[PDB]
Design a protein around this ligand. Structure first.
Ligand code: NAG
Length: 450
């Protein structure tokens, strides 16, 4: 009940890798069937694979024509990965997809990642004449991250997010700004420490007020998302990294997708700290997580068997790095990633992961009422042909279906299935009146004269 009110989300990496509208509709059908509430669609994540009809941008006193932005982005994406299946979703396809999901009671949550995982936008910005948009660390240039000290590149990124946010306004509820790295490829995976370093180790060439600037950046993206009536979300990585609250405060309306509890040399804030600060927590435990193409034990980290085992061993309420506290959650999210985007997407592998997550946490997931609705529509129309006793039993069985609690969980699916089987039995039991019997035999007789 309070369990049923939680979000249950599947995440799909359609930033690195192309997914067709047909493929996503199939994912949505499964999400509805298994009792999920939302599809989390990354469209900006290395690649940028969603294109508005109007891509014109004004940023920091400069104007960029819609057609030039489209060309620049399309090519920037292909420079990351030129996917044989496609390049991007169009605005018509996205609007249709969102409507499709909405008719099935399923929400859509887009991600456009920054300041990291934004290769395609960085490439596009170069083509559009913005100089040095990428962060560089003592001569090593990030392929994925924007330099927060480059005002023009920051202004362009923000203007692009604002344009996506304008489109998603009213059609969606939540917008994921990501915030999940800062130049890990250029700093030996220590981007957050690099941003914090100059405060504790001055005059050594570390980015001046780096982490302070990241906070302002996060907060301004949150302001932008909210100005469009949407809720901002981000991954947990950089939010009070090293539990350091001394650089400033993150906007507490930022919903945190808590995917990692960190590891040796990667010291993220505990979910305990984030919850105490007042951030809502979406449990996105990487115990559940799955990388396309890594389909069985032995094929590397986050293979499908590993994800399945994680789902068995880590319930939806089990959040990374709790430090022993009871962490309240708004929901849970299982994630499929496309780290090697040329890997073949296998729908059946994904659905297995989704089904197991639903089954392991059945009291949280919605029951499936679709077969019940179908059973009702399939009751014969011509009931006057049948015995009063047999018709009354059918009517009773229909009523029992219509009076089922509309808020059953997946754990209570049997209740619905028994009502369906009972209706079918009563329909099977429909018995012709003597008058209908005579008419039917008269009709078989003429039909034989053919
Ligand atoms: C911030 C971060 O590194 N997120 C990573 C994502 O980019 C990657 O696709 C996935 C599987 O390897 O692990 C995620 O959580």
């Amino acid at each position: 009940n309070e369990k049923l009110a939680k979000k249950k989300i599947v995440s799909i990496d359609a930033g690195r890798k192309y997914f067709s509208p047909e493929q996503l509709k199939e994912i949505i059908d499964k999400a509805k069937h298994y009792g999920y509430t939302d599809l989390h669609l990354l469209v900006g994540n290395d690649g940028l694979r969603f294109m508005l009809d109007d891509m014109s941008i004004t940023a920091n006193g400069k104007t960029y024509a819609s057609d030039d932005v489209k060309r620049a982005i399309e090519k920037g994406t292909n420079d990351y990965y030129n996917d044989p299946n496609g390049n991007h979703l169009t605005e018509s396809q996205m609007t249709d997809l969102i409507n499709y999901a909405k008719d099935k009671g399923i929400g859509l949550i887009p991600t456009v990642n920054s300041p990291g995982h934004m290769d395609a936008i960085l490439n596009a910005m170069k083509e559009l004449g913005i100089q040095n948009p990428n962060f560089s660390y003592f001569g090593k240039k990030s392929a994925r991250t924007v330099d927060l000290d480059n005002e023009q590149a920051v202004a362009f990124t923000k203007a692009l997010i604002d344009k996506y946010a304008a489109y998603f306004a009213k059609k969606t509820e939540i917008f994921n700004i990501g915030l999940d790295e800062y130049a890990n490829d250029a700093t030996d995976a220590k981007g957050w420490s690099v941003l914090q370093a100059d405060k504790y180790y001055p005059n050594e060439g570390y980015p001046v007020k780096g982490y302070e600037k990241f906070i302002a950046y996060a907060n301004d993206l949150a302001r932008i998302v909210k100005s469009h009536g949407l809720k901002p979300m981000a991954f947990n990585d950089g939010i009070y990294y090293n539990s350091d609250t001394s650089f400033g405060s993150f906007d507490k309306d930022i919903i945190v997708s808590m995917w990692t509890g960190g590891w040796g040399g990667y010291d993220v804030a505990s979910s305990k700290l984030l919850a105490e600060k007042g951030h809502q927590i979406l449990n996105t435990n990487d115990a559940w997580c799955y990388v396309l193409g890594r389909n069985a034990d032995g094929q590397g980290w986050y293979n499908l068997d590993q994800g399945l085992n994680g789902i068995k061993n880590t319930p939806i309420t089990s959040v990374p790095k709790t430090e022993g506290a009871d962490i309240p959650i708004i929901g849970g999210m299982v994630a499929a990633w496309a780290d090697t985007p040329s890997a073949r997407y296998s729908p059946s592998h994904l659905f297995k992961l989704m089904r197991h997550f639903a089954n392991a946490n059945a009291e949280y997931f919605a029951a499936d009422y679709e077969s019940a609705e179908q059973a009702l529509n399939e009751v014969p129309k011509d009931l006057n042909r049948y015995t009063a006793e047999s018709v009354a039993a059918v009517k009773e069985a229909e009523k029992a279906i219509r009076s089922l609690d509309s808020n059953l969980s997946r754990a209570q699916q049997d209740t619905i299935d028994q009502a369906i089987a009972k209706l079918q039995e009563t329909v099977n039991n429909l018995t012709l009146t003597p008058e209908a019997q005579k008419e039917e035999e008269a009709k078989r007789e003429v039909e034989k004269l053919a």
